[PDB]
Design a protein around this ligand. Structure first.
Ligand SMILES: *[C@@H]1O[C@H](CO)[C@@H](O[C@@H]2O[C@H](CO)[C@@H](O[C@@H]3O[C@H](CO)[C@@H](O)[C@H](O)[C@@H]3O)[C@H](O)[C@H]2NC(C)=O)[C@H](O)[C@H]1NC(C)=O
Ligand SMILES: *[C@@H]1O[C@H](CO)[C@@H](O[C@@H]2O[C@H](CO)[C@@H](O)[C@H](O)[C@H]2NC(C)=O)[C@H](O)[C@H]1NC(C)=O
Ligand SMILES: CC(=O)N[C@@H]1[C@@H](O)[C@H](O)[C@@H](CO)O[C@H]1O
Ligand SMILES: CC(=O)N[C@@H]1[C@@H](O)[C@H](O)[C@@H](CO)O[C@H]1O
Ligand SMILES: CC(=O)N[C@@H]1[C@@H](O)[C@H](O)[C@@H](CO)O[C@H]1O
Ligand SMILES: *[C@@H]1O[C@H](CO)[C@@H](O)[C@H](O)[C@H]1NC(C)=O
Ligand SMILES: *[C@@H]1O[C@H](CO)[C@@H](O)[C@H](O)[C@H]1NC(C)=O
Ligand SMILES: *[C@@H]1O[C@H](CO)[C@@H](O)[C@H](O)[C@H]1NC(C)=O
Ligand SMILES: OC[C@H]1O[C@@H](O)[C@@H](O)[C@@H](O)[C@@H]1O
Ligand SMILES: [Zn+2]
Ligand SMILES: [Zn+2]
Length: 528
């Protein structure tokens, strides 16, 4: 008799559920996973053990509530008649019935119009345990630190200011960054888009994450003084890394410990309005200038690595629907909008990325600039119209990281933006990138000098930095290897790998520049 298959399936996963609520069973799950982690040589056995113990609690809870949930598992196994499998099912937010205005590019600024200067910091990745002289090529996922051991005699230990390896930064190198800003300023505001702790993800307590938050926050406030700083939340701020339960998780395993600390650390910078949304889901909007609205998104709700989204990936925290409300209100007032975030939209989950793309196309006249980080290299994402995928209408700048991780010079970014006056377009006009050349900074007894690496319009011959200029740059680089090599050099903050980037590497790199929407290979149809 097959009329009983659904009842026994539900009985199995119901009993599975209550078994996995008991911590001796959770520990047993961990032990097997540690044993497999060691067999497949993912990491040294100390790291295998540490990372599984850190992850196992929230991970088993999520699986219990999603994949192993009776209505889900039995939906998958036995079809819609028994349950309903909807893990990562597709979803859509709703645009308002206001008609889209005719597409209108930004006006060229009048001669002598005000220019706003924005400092951009991202992926600082302070490593409290950074240790000069240790092995840069140790067996762990992060080196140059306490516990990395010592290098072989043939190779130098980690340099004093950092190293070209899988290493993060000592605090003094961030202090040095902030202390050298004078020539690059003055700044009207700072956009600070996330990733304060380092990549020592196998052992990160809530307290070391908070000490990363509070130490680096106080360091930037000391060097930037009264200049406003607008943070965005990176994927490394939480513990375990990428763990960002949406607001429907209450209780202690939620992100309240993190967002509330951010609200107290960033109170000098954000108005009360902003601090309220920051406590709920780590995003907010404010008004830097009359006529300009800034929106700081928590991209961890789009993230492929945010395992909590297995429970429910549909617009987590209602953030995209909230974003639509702000963009519409901005369109109604004639405001322009800056968006800042950490993970770039092209790297998000499919549904989230497709909805964001739709929002950007709809509000192309109102959105004036987009700024992201997370990849640590210097690149960008072009957005196109939904109807034909061929009219460029927005561009996201992905700034490179202050951290070395992996193999790079430290760097940061400055934007010139159409400034503070009525009728301003508020679009990026040009940008510059500064690096510390570790090859010369790590000379014993040298004092670090942060150097201008390049300015965008001058090295690429751009007449402006509107979306069409970046579209055009990609197709120029398709046919001009020398120009692509310049881009590849700068992509790595002046320290490119020694293995040549040949024809497939180039095409893949160029494709990423046009891929502002995930899982959309048609965007690259003119490259391959
Ligand atoms: C995952 O979370 C999303 C929202 O975060 C859930 O979607 C929500 O589901 C409810 C239940 O169907 C929807 O409510 C319905 O509203 C319609 C119209 O507003 C109304 O006709 C019905 O009476 C019902 O109340 C709600 O609209 C929907 N929200 C969104 C944004 O889609 C979803 O169900 C969750 N999935 C799981 C598996 O928990
Ligand atoms: C709330 O949940 C967190 C999640 O782990 C608990 O954190 C740990 O607390 C113990 C107690 O000192 C530490 O030894 C661990 O290192 C902590 N883990 C992390 C990742 O920081 C916390 O104890 C819980 N608190 C309450 C009141 O339930
Ligand atoms: C839940 C829902 O409505 N999903 C739809 C999906 O079926 C459709 O393919 C897509 C079009 O891009 O729009 C969205
Ligand atoms: C610090 C200061 O006074 N700023 C001025 C303000 O007085 C004035 O109301 C505003 C008009 O929008 O222009 C600005
Ligand atoms: C160690 C190293 O690479 N040193 C180079 C040097 O050879 C070169 O002449 C100079 C100018 O390009 O840049 C630096
Ligand atoms: C048992 O399954 C058969 C097959 O569909 C169905 O015709 C029958 O009505 C079911 N019996 C009950 C009591 O639901
Ligand atoms: C921007 O301009 C407005 C209106 O002229 C002024 O009130 C405000 O103080 C200005 N802010 C900055 C940072 O220049
Ligand atoms: C960094 O310093 C080394 C040491 O002289 C130099 O050869 C190299 O060209 C420099 N690169 C950049 C991008 O400054
Ligand atoms: O960071 C180590 C700390 O973690 C937590 C508890 O286990 C404490 O006993 C311990 O001091
Ligand atoms: Zn990072
Ligand atoms: Zn990141």
């Amino acid at each position: 008799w097959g009329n009983l298959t659904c009842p026994i399936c539900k009985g199995l996963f119901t009993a599975i559920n209550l078994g996995l609520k008991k911590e001796p069973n959770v520990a047993r799950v961990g032990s097997v996973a540690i044993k497999l982690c060691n067999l497949l040589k993912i990491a040294p056995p100390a790291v295998c053990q540490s990372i599984v113990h850190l992850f196992e609690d929230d991970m088993v809870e999520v699986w219990r509530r999603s994949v192993l949930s009776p209505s889900e598992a039995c939906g998958l196994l036995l079809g819609s008649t028994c349950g309903h499998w909807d893990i990562f099912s597709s979803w859509n937010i709703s645009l308002p019935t206001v008609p889209k205005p005719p597409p209108k590019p930004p006006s060229p600024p009048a001669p002598g119009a005000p220019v706003s200067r924005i400092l951009f910091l991202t992926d600082l990745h302070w490593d409290h345990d950074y240790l000069e002289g240790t092995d840069p090529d140790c067996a762990d996922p992060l080196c140059c630190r306490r516990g990395s051991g010592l290098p072989p005699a043939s190779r130098p230990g980690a340099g004093y200011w950092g190293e070209y390896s899988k290493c993060d930064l000592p605090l003094r190198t961030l202090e040095s960054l902030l202390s050298g800003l004078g020539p690059a300023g003055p700044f009207d505001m700072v956009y600070w888009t996330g990733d304060i702790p380092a990549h020592d993800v196998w052992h990160q307590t809530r307290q070391d994450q908070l000490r990363a938050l509070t130490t680096v926050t106080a360091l930037v406030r000391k060097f930037l003084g009264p200049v406003p700083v607008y943070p965005a939340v990176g994927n490394h701020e939480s513990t375990p890394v990428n763990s960002f339960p949406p607001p429907f998780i209450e209780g202690n395993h939620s992100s309240r410990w993190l967002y509330e600390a951010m609200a107290k650390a960033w109170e000098p910078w954000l108005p009360a309005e902003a601090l309220r949304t920051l406590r709920i889901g780590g995003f907010y909007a404010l008004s830097p200038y009359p006529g300009l609205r800034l929106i700081s998104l928590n991209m961890n709700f789009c993230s492929r690595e945010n395992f909590w989204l297995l429970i429910n990936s549909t617009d987590p925290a209602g953030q995209l629907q909230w974003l639509v409300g702000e963009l519409q209100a901005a369109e109604d007032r004639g405001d322009k909008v800056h968006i800042i975030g950490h993970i770039p939209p092209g790297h998000c989950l499919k549904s989230w990325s497709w909805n964001y793309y739709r929002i950007v196309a709809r509000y192309e006249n109102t959105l004036a600039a987009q700024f992201f980080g997370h990849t640590h290299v210097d690149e960008f994402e072009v957005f196109y119209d939904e109807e034909t995928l061929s009219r460029p209408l927005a561009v996201a700048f992905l700034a490179p990281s202050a951290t070395t991780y992996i193999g790079l010079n430290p760097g940061y970014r400055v934007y010139q933006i159409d400034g503070n006056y009525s009728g301003s377009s508020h679009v990026v006009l040009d940008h510059e990138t500064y690096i510390l050349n570790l090859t010369q900074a790590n000379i014993p007894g040298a004092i670090p000098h942060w150097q201008l690496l390049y300015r965008a319009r001058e090295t690429y011959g751009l007449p402006n930095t509107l979306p069409t200029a970046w579209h055009n740059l990609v197709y120029r680089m398709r046919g001009d290897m020398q120009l692509f090599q310049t881009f590849w050099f700068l992509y790595h903050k002046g320290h490119p790998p020694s293995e040549p980037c040949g024809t497939p590497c180039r095409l893949a790199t160029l494709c990423a520049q046009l891929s502002a929407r995930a899982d959309s290979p048609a965007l690259c149809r003119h490259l391959m």
